[PDB]
């Protein structure tokens, strides 16, 4: 008597950690006769002669890049943003045949990458002008400082 049989029963349900993957809209392909030797990242082609005013840092860059970029970008400060908005390839990867964006200085500054060394030093050609109509110089920037800029690659 007195001793009460207490039931220590407790119902415990176990849940499941399920995960959902990401998958949205696809992209559109273009068409043109252009023998490319590299693996081209899907980018558009605003290829035209230099339509920019003669004297701004963006001007000689537009000519150095063969005019394969859209003049509709504006100043060097916007170039990388407009590139993305236009369907181009913008990465901080130091590579030849690309434009590096500074943004600093106010309206931004840019130059054309002639060549990149294994050392990491990036040689960007910029026109000094003071001296002659084609007074240009290949500014060899250090890897650390160079990687600090946004490179627009033409694929």
Structure description:
The protein has 155 residues and is α+β, with helices and mostly antiparallel strands. The chain has a domain at 56-155: endopeptidase domain like (from Nostoc punctiforme) (endopeptidase fold (from Nostoc punctiforme), Alpha-Beta Complex). Helix content is 15%, strand content 19%. The chain has helices spanning 57-64, 76-86, 143-146, and strands spanning 89-91, 98-101, 110-116, 122-127, 136-141, 150-153. It has a six-stranded antiparallel β-sheet with strand order 1-6-2-3-4-5. Strand 3 and strand 4 form a beta hairpin. It is elongated, with a radius of gyration of 27 Å. Residues 32-48 have a biased composition (Low complexity). Residues 28-48 are annotated as: Disordered. This is Putative secretory antigen. Residues 32-153 form the Peptidase C51 domain.
How is the topology of this model organized?
Elements: H1 57-64, H2 76-86, E1 89-91, E2 98-101, E3 110-116, E4 122-127, E5 136-141, H3 143-146, E6 150-153
Antiparallel strand pairs: 1-6, 2-3, 2-6, 3-4, 4-5
Organism: Staphylococcus saprophyticus subsp. saprophyticus (strain ATCC 15305 / DSM 20229 / NCIMB 8711 / NCTC 7292 / S-41)
Pfam families: CHAP
InterPro entries: CHAP_dom, Papain-like_cys_pep_sf
């Amino acid at each position: 008597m007195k001793k009460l049989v207490t039931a220590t029963t407790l119902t415990a349900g176990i849940g499941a950690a399920i995960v959902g993957l990401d998958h949205g809209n696809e992209a559109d392909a273009a068409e043109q006769t252009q023998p490319t030797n590299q693996s081209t990242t899907q980018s558009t082609s605003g290829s035209s002669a230099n339509l920019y005013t003669a004297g701004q840092c963006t001007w000689y860059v537009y000519d150095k890049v063969g005019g394969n970029i859209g003049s509709t970008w504006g100043n060097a400060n916007n170039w990388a943003s407009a590139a993305s908005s236009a369907g181009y390839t913008v990465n901080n990867s130091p590579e030849a045949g690309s434009i590096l964006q500074s943004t600093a200085g106010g309206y931004g500054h840019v130059a054309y990458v002639e060549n990149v060394n294994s050392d990491g030093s990036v040689e960007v050609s910029e026109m000094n002008y003071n001296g002659g109509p084609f007074s240009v110089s290949e500014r060899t920037i250090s890897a650390g400082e160079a990687s600090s800029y946004n490179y627009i690659h033409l694929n």
